[PDB]
Tab-separated table of all heavy atoms in Angstrom:
chain	number	residue	atom	x	y	z
A	108	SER	N	-16.905	3.042	1.358
A	108	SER	CA	-16.483	1.669	1.369
A	108	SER	C	-15.314	1.522	2.325
A	108	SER	O	-14.555	2.456	2.527
A	108	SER	CB	-16.015	1.278	-0.027
A	108	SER	OG	-15.597	-0.083	-0.058
A	109	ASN	N	-15.154	0.351	2.909
A	109	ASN	CA	-13.932	0.074	3.593
A	109	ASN	C	-13.278	-1.180	3.037
A	109	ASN	O	-12.529	-1.878	3.732
A	109	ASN	CB	-14.165	-0.015	5.092
A	109	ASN	CG	-15.149	-1.093	5.464
A	109	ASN	OD1	-15.498	-1.948	4.649
A	109	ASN	ND2	-15.617	-1.051	6.703
A	110	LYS	N	-13.574	-1.472	1.776
A	110	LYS	CA	-12.871	-2.537	1.065
A	110	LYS	C	-12.084	-1.955	-0.123
A	110	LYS	O	-12.607	-1.197	-0.923
A	110	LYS	CB	-13.834	-3.679	0.655
A	110	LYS	CG	-14.349	-4.573	1.862
A	110	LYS	CD	-15.847	-4.320	2.177
A	110	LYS	CE	-16.389	-5.129	3.366
A	110	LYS	NZ	-15.729	-4.910	4.737
A	111	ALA	N	-10.812	-2.289	-0.211
A	111	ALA	CA	-9.997	-1.840	-1.313
A	111	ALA	C	-10.283	-2.645	-2.598
A	111	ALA	O	-10.674	-3.833	-2.554
A	111	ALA	CB	-8.541	-1.964	-0.928
A	112	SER	N	-10.084	-1.990	-3.743
A	112	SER	CA	-9.938	-2.677	-5.026
A	112	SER	C	-8.846	-3.747	-5.019
A	112	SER	O	-7.809	-3.629	-4.308
A	112	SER	CB	-9.557	-1.662	-6.071
A	112	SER	OG	-10.664	-0.846	-6.363
A	113	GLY	N	-9.079	-4.798	-5.805
A	113	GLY	CA	-8.057	-5.816	-6.048
A	113	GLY	C	-6.885	-5.177	-6.789
A	113	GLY	O	-7.047	-4.109	-7.417
A	114	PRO	N	-5.709	-5.832	-6.749
A	114	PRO	CA	-4.470	-5.238	-7.265
A	114	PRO	C	-4.516	-4.950	-8.772
A	114	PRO	O	-5.165	-5.672	-9.530
A	114	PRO	CB	-3.402	-6.290	-6.933
A	114	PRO	CG	-4.140	-7.580	-6.811
A	114	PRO	CD	-5.552	-7.258	-6.406
A	115	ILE	N	-3.831	-3.892	-9.187
A	115	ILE	CA	-3.910	-3.426	-10.576
A	115	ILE	C	-3.371	-4.432	-11.594
A	115	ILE	O	-2.483	-5.231	-11.284
A	115	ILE	CB	-3.193	-2.057	-10.779
A	115	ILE	CG1	-1.696	-2.176	-10.462
A	115	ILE	CG2	-3.910	-0.971	-9.994
A	115	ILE	CD1	-0.913	-0.937	-10.711
A	116	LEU	N	-3.922	-4.386	-12.804
A	116	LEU	CA	-3.382	-5.160	-13.923
A	116	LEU	C	-2.249	-4.389	-14.561
A	116	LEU	O	-2.297	-3.159	-14.615
A	116	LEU	CB	-4.452	-5.422	-14.981
A	116	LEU	CG	-5.594	-6.364	-14.580
A	116	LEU	CD1	-6.652	-6.303	-15.661
A	116	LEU	CD2	-5.121	-7.800	-14.360
A	117	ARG	N	-1.233	-5.098	-15.037
A	117	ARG	CA	-0.241	-4.466	-15.890
A	117	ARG	C	-0.371	-5.032	-17.306
A	117	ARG	O	0.288	-5.999	-17.657
A	117	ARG	CB	1.177	-4.653	-15.332
A	117	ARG	CG	1.370	-4.340	-13.843
A	117	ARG	CD	0.885	-2.962	-13.408
A	117	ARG	NE	1.390	-1.886	-14.257
A	117	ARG	CZ	2.563	-1.275	-14.107
A	117	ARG	NH1	3.384	-1.610	-13.104
A	117	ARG	NH2	2.905	-0.314	-14.966
A	118	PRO	N	-1.230	-4.441	-18.137
A	118	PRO	CA	-1.454	-5.002	-19.473
A	118	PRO	C	-0.167	-5.076	-20.279
A	118	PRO	O	0.692	-4.198	-20.139
A	118	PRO	CB	-2.400	-3.996	-20.128
A	118	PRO	CG	-2.951	-3.195	-19.018
A	118	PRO	CD	-1.879	-3.135	-17.983
A	119	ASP	N	-0.036	-6.102	-21.117
A	119	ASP	CA	1.150	-6.258	-21.971
A	119	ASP	C	1.423	-5.002	-22.793
A	119	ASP	O	0.497	-4.369	-23.309
A	119	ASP	CB	0.960	-7.435	-22.934
A	119	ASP	CG	1.154	-8.787	-22.259
A	119	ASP	OD1	2.047	-8.913	-21.367
A	119	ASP	OD2	0.408	-9.724	-22.635
A	120	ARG	N	2.695	-4.645	-22.903
A	120	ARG	CA	3.103	-3.579	-23.785
A	120	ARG	C	2.697	-3.988	-25.190
A	120	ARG	O	2.930	-5.127	-25.584
A	120	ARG	CB	4.617	-3.406	-23.712
A	120	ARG	CG	5.188	-2.266	-24.544
A	120	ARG	CD	6.711	-2.201	-24.388
A	120	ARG	NE	7.096	-1.882	-23.020
A	120	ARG	CZ	7.387	-0.655	-22.583
A	120	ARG	NH1	7.359	0.387	-23.422
A	120	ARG	NH2	7.727	-0.479	-21.297
Side-chain angles (χ1 to χ4, degrees):
Chain A
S108 180
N109 59 13
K110 288 109 182 60
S112 288
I115 62 176
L116 292 170
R117 312 307 310 274
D119 283 323
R120 183 180 296 264

